[PDB]
Amino acid sequence: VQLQESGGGLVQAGGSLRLSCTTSGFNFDDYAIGWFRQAPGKEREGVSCIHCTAYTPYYARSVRDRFTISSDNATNTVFLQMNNLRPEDTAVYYCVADATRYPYPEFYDYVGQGTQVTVS
Amino acid sequence: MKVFNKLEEWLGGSLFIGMFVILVMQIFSRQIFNSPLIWSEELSRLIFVYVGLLGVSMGIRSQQHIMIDFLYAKFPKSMQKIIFTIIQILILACLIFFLYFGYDLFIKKEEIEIVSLGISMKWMYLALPLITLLMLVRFYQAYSENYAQNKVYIKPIFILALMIILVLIAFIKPELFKILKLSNYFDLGEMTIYYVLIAWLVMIFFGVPVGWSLLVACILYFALTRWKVVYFAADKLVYSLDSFSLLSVPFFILTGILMNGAGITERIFNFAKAMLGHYTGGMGHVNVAASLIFSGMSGSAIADAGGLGQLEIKAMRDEGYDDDICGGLTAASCIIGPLVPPSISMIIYGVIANQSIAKLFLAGFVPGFLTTIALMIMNYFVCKKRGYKKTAKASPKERWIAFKKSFWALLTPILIIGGIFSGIFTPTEAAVIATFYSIILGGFIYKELTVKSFFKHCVEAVAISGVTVLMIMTVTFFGDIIAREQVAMRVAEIFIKYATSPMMVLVMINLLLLFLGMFIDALALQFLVLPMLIPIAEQVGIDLVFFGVMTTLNMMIGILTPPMGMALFVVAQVGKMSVSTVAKGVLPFLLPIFITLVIITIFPQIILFLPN
Ligand SMILES: CCCCCCCCCCCCCCCCCCCC(=O)O[C@H](COC(=O)CCCCCCCCCCCCCC)COP(=O)(O)OCCN
Ligand code: NA
Ligand code: NA
Structure with missing residues (x-):
């Protein structure tokens, strides 16, 4: 179960970053996929997930309405589009996948390397 | 003894008066002089955690926790004992959950230190299991009362044996609880929250108290999907009492009694x-x-x-x-x-x-x-x-x-x-x-207003606020479960x-x-x-x-x-x-x-x- 990430870097406010996560070694549809965030030294916080919630994707309270999670079953890819990046989002974003469809991306079994997001 | 059977009374009144004095000192030293205290709010909240848990224990003893009995009172007498026995067993399961996941939190947060007081955070989380033992005591006494009036079916020595057996299993070999893990039996998919919810409703309409019903709903949801996260979500049972906006719940109750018992x-x-x-x-x-x-x-x-x-x-x-x-x-x-x-x-x-x-x-x-x-x-x-x-x-x-x-x-x-x-x-x-x-x-x-009457009013203020504290701390637990599932x-x-x-x-x-x-x-x-x-x-x-x-x-x-x-x-x-x-x-x-x-x-x- 390989989760390889891409995207990120340093931006200003409203930089509208975009992240991608390619998943391999399982059914892209069965496993709930998602992203979580971890500040440089603080506790990890879930960001988003698809296939977790029954009807609509799960978004955290502090990332609602300004983060969008998109799926591409053709290439088995998950995209995260950010909007209005406040300087409090300078952290590491990890792509996770799990065999159980429940909306807790911070406690999912698998996890990728992680990408750095810096906001000035 | 006869002073142990009234222990939350004199341990909640004294802590309530201590919290009251500390907050009064803070108010005066911030207003009259420009020299505010820094250890006042956090110490008062630390005391209020214990005060609220003592109020919860009093509610357990008196069976005064809020329930919804619109349909419960309509059952026949014969068919009501079965439901009440099952409700008591559900409350017992809630109390054992409290004990286990309060002891784990106490043993996990021994490193984080409260900045103002200088003591470790565990002295707050210690309130959760330490009072819970007391709760169990009260629970048993309550059940004995419920058995003296023929309101249950199981003899209250089997309940004591079950209680001590469950505590010994929880603190000796917790692995034996993995039999009860429902995720080994049921695969409901992504729509488990729409089952536990209706289960919750059933529990609500059979007379289970609101706080215990919410806690059982959380336990069911975490057993049906993945138990490993309930070790981290249970923190919301204590973080919801360390609130400065919640200290006003007892005081506004207290000033609502001192304005009646004083002949005002x-x-x-x-x-x-x-x-x-x-x-x-x-x-x-x-x-x-x-x-x-x-x-x-x-x-x-x-x-x-x-x-x-x-x-x-x-x-x-x-x-x-x-x-x-x-x-x-x-x-x-x-x-x-x-x-x-x-x-x-x-x-x-x-x-x-x-x-x-x-x-x-x-x-x-x-x-x-x-x-x-x-x-x-x-x-x-x-x-x-x-x-x-x-x-x-x-x-x-x-x-x-x-x-x-x-x-x-x-x-x-x-x-x-x-x-x-x-x-x-x-x-x-x-x-x-x-x-x-x-x-x-x-x-x-x-x-x-005397001193004995003032102390009695403090005790009943704590007793009144306990039945709200329980529902607050279980609603905070269930809200995140119901809000992550959209x-x-x-x-x-x-x-x-x-x-x-x-x-x-x-x-x-x-x-x-x-x-x-x-x-x-x-x-x-x-x-x-x-x-x-x-x-x-x-x-x-x-x-x-x-x-x-x-x-x-x-x-x-x-x-x-x-x-x-x-x-x-x-x-x-x-x-x-x-x-x-x-x-x-x-x-x-x-x-x-x-x-x-x-x-x-x-x-x-x-x-x-x-x-x-
Ligand atoms: C005469 C009396 C007749 C009636 C008898 C009634 C008996 C049932 C009483 C219910 C008890 C519920 C207790 C709930 C809190 C459990 C406390 C923590 C348990 C715990 O840590 O268990 C982990 C897994 O257990 C789990 O996964 C346990 C989850 C339990 C959830 C609730 C189950 C649904 C209800 C089923 C009712 C069945 C009734 C029929 C008998 C162990 O693992 P670990 O990671 O801690 O490893 C240990 C390494 N340190
Ligand atoms: Na009023
Ligand atoms: Na009136």
Whole structure:
């Protein structure tokens, strides 16, 4: 179960970053996929997930309405589009996948390397 | 011993008085001198964790935790023992969950240190398992009582054996609990939350207490998906009590008793009876004005009814008023209590909805005056139609003598409301200063408060606040479960499908609440529906301060609707009249309340005036 990430870097406010996560070694549809965030030294916080919630994707309270999670079953890819990046989002974003469809991306079994997001 | 069986009493009263003294010191040292203390708030919250858990233990012992018994009382006697036995076993499972995941939290947070106090955080989390053992003790005693009256089926030695066996398994070989893990048996997919929810509803309608029902729902959800996360979510059982906005829940209760047991409400009623009472239907005006002035000190409708019903009914029936109007007006004027600041329903809403409490108070001030004016107008019309006689005007000497006698009481709202509106005091600092002023009033200006009676009032304040603390800390646990699964978003989509304009959404919400409040008590309803109804109001664009005021006023009607009305029962008890008479007498007076509800629904700018 390989989760390889891409995207990120340093931006200003409203930089509208975009992240991608390619998943391999399982059914892209069965496993709930998602992203979580971890500040440089603080506790990890879930960001988003698809296939977790029954009807609509799960978004955290502090990332609602300004983060969008998109799926591409053709290439088995998950995209995260950010909007209005406040300087409090300078952290590491990890792509996770799990065999159980429940909306807790911070406690999912698998996890990728992680990408750095810096906001000035 | 006979002092262990009353242990939460003297361990909660003493800690309550300590917290009260610490907060008083903080207030004085911040206002009188420009030298605030830094260890006051955190130490007071640390003490309040233990105080609230002791209140929860008292509630467990007395079996006073709120339940919904609309359908529970309709079962036959034979078929009710089985359900009650299962409910007791569910409560036992909740207590063992508390013990295990409080001990784990205590042993996990020994490194994080409280900055101001200098002690480790564990001294807070130690409150969760340490009191829980006590709870188990109380539970067993309660069950023995329940067995002495033939209210259960299992002999209370099997319950003791099961309790000690479960504790020994939980602290010796917890692995044996993996048999109960339901995720090994059921694969419900992504729609497990829509099963546990209905399970929750079943538990709610079979008589399980609201706090224990919510905790069992959380346990079921985490057992059905993945247990490994309940070790991290259980922290919300303690983080929800370390709140400074929650300390105002007991104090506003305490100042609602020290203002009755000190013989203060009699003076206020005498002042109102002097000023009014010579008008057309003057005694009704006296009733409503006394309730309006007393609403600025207490924050509960039941306290208002219990403290003023006998006086008001006696004064009204001295003038030849009929029983129906007496009961109806003294029951309808209660609702002015939880509307004018301070109020406890708005504090509960501000905790649940994460809203500001000063803004909630200022917003809810105006609907109280609208209800007061509407009730005065309706009472005037009723009395002028019935043609009741008019009392002679009070002599100019008495109208001043009564005011001077009940002059120090009238300054309590100016300390509270004037302390909150002017921004000098936060709601909790306002609560503490109101408690201090009530003590000065009852013990040193009117000389009617002793030390033993003050301690008893502190103990019963803790006992009252415990049954709210339990529901608060289990609702906080269940809210994240219900909000990560986006149930409220689906319900909001359904509402928007059925309701076109946001006004239609408001009408549908109000009809739902009015229908539910007929059979469900206000306190239980506020935790039953509000967690799953605030997100809908947020999504459809409704302001949440106005929504809180509207829901408070909508549930305050629910204590007058006579399939289940708490105010009707209280007034019937204090007036020596049938509940049928009180229920029939409040029918004319529901029109002004409905008019107020409508004109604040279609003109929200009325409410959102003082906060802005
Ligand atoms: C005469 C009396 C007749 C009636 C008998 C009643 C018996 C049932 C009583 C219910 C007890 C419920 C207790 C709930 C809290 C459990 C406390 C923590 C348990 C725990 O840590 O268990 C982990 C897994 O257990 C789990 O996964 C346990 C989850 C339990 C959830 C609730 C189960 C659903 C209800 C099933 C009812 C069945 C009734 C029929 C008998 C162990 O693993 P670990 O990671 O801690 O490893 C340990 C390494 N340190
Ligand atoms: Na009040
Ligand atoms: Na009253």
